[PDB]
Paper text:
Three structures of AA9 from LsAA9A and Thermoascus aurantiacus (TaAA9A) were determined in this study. Three out of the six high resolution AA9A structures, two from Lentinus similis (two different data sets for the same enzyme) and one from Thermoascus aurantiacus, were determined in this study. The data for all the three structures extends to very high resolutions. His147 in LsAA9A and His164 in TaAA9A were investigated for the protonation states at Nδ1 and Nε2 atoms of the imidazole ring of the histidines. Here, the His residues (of the primary and secondary coordination spheres) undergo unrestrained refinement, while the residues in the rest of the structure undergo restrained refinement. Our results suggest that the His of the secondary co-ordination sphere is singly protonated at the Nε2 atom in most if not all structures. Computational studies on LsAA9A have also shown that the H2O2 co-substrate does not require proton transfer (and thus double protonation). A new experimental study further highlights that H2O2 is the co-substrate strictly required for LsAA9A glycosidic bond cleavage activity. Thus, at least for LsAA9A there is currently no evidence of His147 double protonation or proton transfer being necessary for the mechanism.
Lytic Polysaccharide Monooxygenases (LPMOs) are a recently discovered group of copper metalloenzymes that depolymerize recalcitrant polysaccharides like lignocellulose and chitin by oxidative cleavage of the glycosidic bonds. The His-brace is made up of the Cu metal center coordinated with the imidazole ring Nδ1 and backbone N atoms of the terminal His and the imidazole ring nitrogen Nε2 atom of a His located later in the protein sequence. In this study, the focus is on AA9 LPMOs, where a conserved His and Gln (His147 and Gln162 in LsAA9A) form the 2nd coordination sphere and a strong H-bonding network has been shown in the crystal structures. Our results reveal that the conserved His residue of the 2nd coordination sphere in AA9 LPMOs is generally singly protonated.
Numbering used by the authors: 1 to 235
The structure:
Amino acid sequence: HTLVWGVWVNGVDQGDGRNIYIRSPPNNNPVKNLTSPDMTCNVDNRVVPKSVPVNAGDTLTFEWYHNTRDDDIIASSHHGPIAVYIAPAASNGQGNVWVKLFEDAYNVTNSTWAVDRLITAHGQHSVVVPHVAPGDYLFRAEIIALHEADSLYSQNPIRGAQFYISCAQITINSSDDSTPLPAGVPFPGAYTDSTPGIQFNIYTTPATSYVAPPPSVWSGALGGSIAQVGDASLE
Ligand SMILES: [Cl-]
Ligand SMILES: [Cl-]
Ligand SMILES: [Cl-]
Ligand SMILES: [Cl-]
Ligand SMILES: [Cl-]
Ligand SMILES: [Cu+2]
């Protein structure tokens, strides 16, 4: 159970974005139905009044929280991967538009899931803004909590993978457009019951075996991190 508070741009807090530049849902409950329209941008997908200005090459940091800013972020039980996707805003997230910019899943090197790292990072994870066309975009940050994912939601709706989805409105101002954005995948649609990484037993299946759901990270993506970029208590 987690939500996006706001974003940082090059280590500068853009302030509370909830219902402002984040298409915030009403609460922190997961999406679970893989065919749901709610897979696009969560349960209240609508235009919000502000879009955060960035330039290509900026570090854009999403900041998550549980109940209040800079709290426990997400329950530690919620082990799973983190991904970020981009789509042109005019799409409203519809059709074959979502391009993956970032994936972290299980990290053998230090025996962490992405979610574990997110908690350590005070809810903060980042992407480099890609060299796409100037204009308005949706950045879709997605946490998959796997603690109940040994069952399919379609078999038992009390369980299943849990999707914490947040769409931020981002305006890319300066960009040389050296990596034009291609068509992408649909949400809903890209994840199905058989997709790798949707049905997974963290209790009995080795985490080193986990494969995150496709699609693969786009060739144009410039990277990211899961790491604190600024101290929210420093304000
Ligand atoms: Cl839960
Ligand atoms: Cl950190
Ligand atoms: Cl099942
Ligand atoms: Cl990949
Ligand atoms: Cl490319
Ligand atoms: Cu939860």
